[PDB]
Amino acid sequence: YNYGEALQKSIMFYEFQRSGDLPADKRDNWRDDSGMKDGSDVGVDLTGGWYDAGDHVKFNLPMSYTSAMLAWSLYEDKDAYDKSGQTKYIMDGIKWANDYFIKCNPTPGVYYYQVGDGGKDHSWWGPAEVMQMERPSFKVDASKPGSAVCASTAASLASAAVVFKSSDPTYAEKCISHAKNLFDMADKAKSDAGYTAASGYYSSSSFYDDLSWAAVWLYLATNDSTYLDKAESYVPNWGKEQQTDIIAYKWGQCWDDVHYGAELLLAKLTNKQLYKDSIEMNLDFWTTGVNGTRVSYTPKGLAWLFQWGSLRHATTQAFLAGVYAEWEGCTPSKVSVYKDFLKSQIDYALGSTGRSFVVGYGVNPPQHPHHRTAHGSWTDQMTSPTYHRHTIYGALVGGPDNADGYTDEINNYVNNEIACDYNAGFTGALAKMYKHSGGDPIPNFKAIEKITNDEVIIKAGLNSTGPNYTEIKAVVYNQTGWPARVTDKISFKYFMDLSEIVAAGIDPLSLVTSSNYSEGKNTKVSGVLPWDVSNNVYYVNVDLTGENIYPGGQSACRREVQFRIAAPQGTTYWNPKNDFSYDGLPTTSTVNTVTNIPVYDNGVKVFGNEP
Ligand SMILES: OC[C@H]1O[C@@H](O[C@H]2[C@H](O)[C@@H](O)[C@H](O[C@H]3[C@H](O)[C@@H](O)[C@H](O)O[C@@H]3CO)O[C@@H]2CO)[C@H](O)[C@@H](O)[C@@H]1O
Ligand SMILES: OC[C@H]1O[C@@H](O[C@H]2[C@H](O)[C@@H](O)[C@H](O)O[C@@H]2CO)[C@H](O)[C@@H](O)[C@@H]1O
Ligand SMILES: [Ca+2]
Ligand SMILES: [Ca+2]
Ligand SMILES: [Mg+2]
Ligand SMILES: [Mg+2]
Ligand SMILES: [Mg+2]
Ligand SMILES: [Mg+2]
């Protein structure tokens, strides 16, 4: 498999998750500014960071877990990133998350750990750029603690400091300053009691693991052994295997449990047997098995841990196995076992079963990941359109069940959602496979997509008619996607040939235009205006400027306008047949897309034709 391309796309995945004011240097044409008022409720700029999964909540625990894991990869395999030419991209990602965590620590002792409400956010299915719901900010402090999330963020900031120190020593120091404050908060409190806004999504079941993980990274960033001593001091407090006094080993590294990564690092830093034994017990359980126990394996080779995000778990363990196998302290006989495991799990994700589980990569990749912005519905419907308008490159889907079963459907969020933490360890494992087996990334890769549907259209039909008038029912639709956006400067024009009016000795400008119905309070229908009088062409201008038309609902994306143009009552010379906009017009109140009632966006024609 082409591991370099996979690595390249896995890193790119995060760029599509970005919230906030996006860079001018962005390499896609379908994501734009969003969550621009994040933090406005507390008077703090909390814009930026990454949306968690297929949704738009910013959950700092998995977000910081993710950036800490990406930095860990860059720390372990900078040469792989340099050789593949992806170094700039992963560093930009790491900085994107950490710049946001810094904003979340506005003053010593205060940490905002979330922006958005799961309940409200998930109740709407649409693109990030046009979210209309409230996005509350939540914080922890001395009176309401969040040890896991504060320490997880400290680990992200400290690991970022380690990998940025050589090229940007000042940013490294900035990261360390904030990591120290957040760790102090976490260490002083030793409680997750104030971390409640993520209930039902990312509630924490442990924080001593996060304390050790953060302390290890702060040790590597500052070289102050005060932190190494702390890291080791929490070990007795880590969860144990049931009815044993053995450090847990039957799960895997993940957003809720980072003792696996902490013990791996502590083994390399101290060479103490306790840590070596602990990480090898975990890696053994995942490979050969240990003490009669072994993680389940699917018939096709996937180490299967749990129903949700099976690939996320397997590929993360693959990364840890790769890191540990390269360490001189690893039991020699297990080096090959662990490396074989890294390859088998990554290959399963990339295509060993005959298809890829990575969006926009390989053979028969997933087409319907549970992701709002990549899908791009403009009607608040998971079912419409019936295909994803965008390709969210690099995203690793949840994964199959214990029997390799997998259904690529948008509503399957258990096995087909995509998320920050899903790609975290995966990215690191990919860097290792690239280093070993290669595969050239795509040069100058970008995600500038072809526009696949007219972004703003109009449908019309004959509402009412008479010997002296024509009444039109028109509906404008915002189907924007590159990027999805509010269209508050839309207008359209209805063209007529009024030669018969001039011939009747009547002023075309005196005809009466009117509207008996229209959605939108700003809808304005003009009187008859001249367009090309040499050919007796006049028009009615319908301005929708000011209307908050956006691709996020059946009513939200459309504006209906009914308007009539009429010659004097009792007259019979009105002739709609020579009117440009009347040609082909649906003969009734049931509208259809028309191309002769042009739509304009800030005066620029974007749909339809003029006379
Ligand atoms: O031995 C059990 C292990 O449990 C781990 O916690 C897991 C929770 O039990 C599980 O409910 C939760 O599932 C999440 C999933 O992680 C998340 O990514 C997905 O989006 O939603 C699911 C809930 O609907 O996962 C956590 C973490 O794996 C402990 O962390 C671990 O120590 C313990 O051994
Ligand atoms: O929490 C699981 C999953 O929920 C997704 O939102 C669901 C919501 O949970 C359900 O009550 C509603 O009926 O449908 C929506 C859309 O499927 C959410 O999109 C995922 O991010 C989340 O993992
Ligand atoms: Ca934890
Ligand atoms: Ca006419
Ligand atoms: Mg900008
Ligand atoms: Mg979820
Ligand atoms: Mg399909
Ligand atoms: Mg004519």
Swiss-Prot record:
Which residues does the entry assign to the active site, renumbered to this chain?
Answer: 55 (nucleophile), 370, 408, 417
Q: What is its EC number?
A: 3.2.1.4
Question: Locate the CBM3 domain: which residues?
Answer: 451-611
Pathway terms, separated by semicolons: Glycan metabolism; cellulose degradation
Catalytic activity, reaction form = Endohydrolysis of (1->4)-beta-D-glucosidic linkages in cellulose, lichenin and cereal beta-D-glucans
Q: Biological process (GO) annotations?
A: cellulose catabolic process
Query: What residues form the membrane-spanning segments?
Result: none
Key words, A-Z: Carbohydrate metabolism, Cellulose degradation, Glycosidase, Hydrolase, Polysaccharide degradation, Signal
A molecular function (GO) held by this record is: cellulase activity
The entry's family comment says:
Belongs to the glycosyl hydrolase 9 (cellulase E) family.
Described function: The biological conversion of cellulose to glucose generally requires three types of hydrolytic enzymes: (1) Endoglucanases which cut internal beta-1,4-glucosidic bonds; (2) Exocellobiohydrolases that cut the disaccharide cellobiose from the non-reducing end of the cellulose polymer chain; (3) Beta-1,4-glucosidases which hydrolyze the cellobiose and other short cello-oligosaccharides to glucose.
What name appears for this protein in its UniProt entry?
A: Endoglucanase G
Organism of provenance? Ruminiclostridium cellulolyticum (strain ATCC 35319 / DSM 5812 / JCM 6584 / H10)
Q: Which gene encodes it?
A: celCCG
Range of the intact protein held here: 39 to 649 of 725
